[PDB]
Amino acid sequence: SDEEFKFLATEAKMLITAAERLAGTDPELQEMVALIKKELEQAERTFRNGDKSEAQRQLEFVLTAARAVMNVAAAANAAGTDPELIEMVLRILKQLKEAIRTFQNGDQEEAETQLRFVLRAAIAVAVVAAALVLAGTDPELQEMVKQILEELKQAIETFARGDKEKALTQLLFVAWAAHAVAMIAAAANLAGTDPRLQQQVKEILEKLKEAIETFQKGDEEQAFRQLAEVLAEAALVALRAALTN
Amino acid sequence: DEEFKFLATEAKMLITAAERLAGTDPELQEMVALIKKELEQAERTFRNGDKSEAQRQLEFVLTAARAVMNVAAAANAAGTDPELIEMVLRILKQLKEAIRTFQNGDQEEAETQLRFVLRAAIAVAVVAAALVLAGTDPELQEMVKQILEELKQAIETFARGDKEKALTQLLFVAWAAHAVAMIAAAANLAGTDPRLQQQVKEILEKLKEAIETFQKGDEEQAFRQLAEVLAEAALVALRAALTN
């Protein structure tokens, strides 16, 4: 599709420009962005003279990577000097560069699989990092982000051991749970002195603690249902607090 | 299959959160229940039929669930604003046609329709969020409702068959409404801080220029300026949040 290709490359170039600005002076980040910008050029040349279908796959792959380096650049900014998050970023960066190298050397299905995981991990570390920021000085919210980060550490080691689906599922849990923490920390600031809104936020927070613990206990169907509900309720209460003033 | 179980797990969460965000709205609940139905059939076909058809059917359901989650979010954030309500119902309508196209059989046309609907669903939710973060700011509310007009232009361009021009326009809508949201959140976090306020003002002026350039038809340059603005809005929203 010649007009669809132009559209996907437009998005890829936006993500790449933004990632490069977000990456600032970080060498690993700048290197990944530069590597991916070069890969977009290779998809465009392939489009300009070669096989449109090969360019399309090349380009769809560049798009996933650019999404991932965008998320990793955001995490690295938000994380500042937190050593655990910096260790995570560096690991995701390592995996993404290996994804690209594997893709360049022609085994595209195995690198596309790797890239899927990298993107989820990059989304996970970005919302964890943003949740740390929003939790501010609140120890209960910090303690929860600390657990959720540890679950993220486990997912990467789990993937390296070959249980891809379990690790991916664990990234999915990590992304939603740290997103709820962000929402809940936002809600408790948007509620102020209002005692109804504070109580409503506390109850939801208790539902997150329950869902995190169910997941750690291994009943995943129930824990995922609780998390999805928490997210909707945290959203609804954050919206309601925003509107009372 | 390992991928299929993880895909149904993601679709389930999106469907579960969309039900709660639907509340008692019947049009949104109709949409949720309808996508939940297709998820079950997908899982019934993986259970008692061909697994290859179930996974193409599940990947469609999963995009539908992301879309319906976005629109239900947007419907909540719209409150009683008549432009946004109207946009939401228009995307709900388009989403229903897409599902109905897939349920009949033209799966490739369902998928290209659904790809578009998911973008409009994303764009209308960020407009909605940005309108809330805009609060009582008249400058920001103008821009947001400006961006929503761009959004309405896209849906009709697409309904006329110029599919890729319209996709480019939603893309612009989403990054621009997103940038407004970031600038608004950063202004709220900065309080009265002299420098942070000046820095937010600078970014707003570059966002208006990007919008202006896009309206002139210089897409390549507007996309560059917008991608730049979004990174700069984000860095400044972080330094502000790291203050208060």
Author numbering:
A (entry chain B): 0 to 244
B (entry chain A): 1 to 244
Structure paper excerpt:
To investigate the photophysics of special pairs independently of the complexities of native photosynthetic proteins, and as a first step toward creating synthetic photosystems for new energy conversion technologies, we designed C2-symmetric proteins that hold two chlorophyll molecules in closely juxtaposed arrangements. For Chl dimer protein scaffolds, we chose hyperstable C2-symmetric repeat protein dimers containing symmetric pockets with tunable sizes and geometries. In this dimeric repeat protein architecture, the hydrophobic core is independent of the small molecule-binding site, enabling full customization for binding with little impact on the overall protein structure. We describe de novo-designed proteins that hold Chl dimers in precisely defined, closely juxtaposed geometries.
The apo- and holo-state amino acid backbones both agree with the SP2 design model to within 1.4 Å r.m.s.d. The holo-state crystal structure has two copies of the SP2 dimer in the asymmetric unit; alignment of the two ZnPPaM dimers shows that their binding geometries are equivalent, with an r.m.s.d of 0.22 Å over the tetrapyrrole rings. Despite the accuracy of the protein backbone design, the crystal structure shows that the ZnPPaM molecules are rotated and translated relative to the design model (3.5 Å r.m.s.d. across tetrapyrrole ring atoms). Compared with the apo-state crystal structure, the SP2 binding cavity widens by ~1.6 Å in the presence of ZnPPaM; this expansion provides the extra volume needed for the ZnPPaM molecules to adopt their unexpected conformation. Using the SP2−ZnPPaM dimer crystal structure, we calculated an excitonic coupling energy of 241 cm−1. The close agreement between the calculated and experimental data supports the conclusion that the SP2−ZnPPaM dimer system exhibits excitonic delocalization.
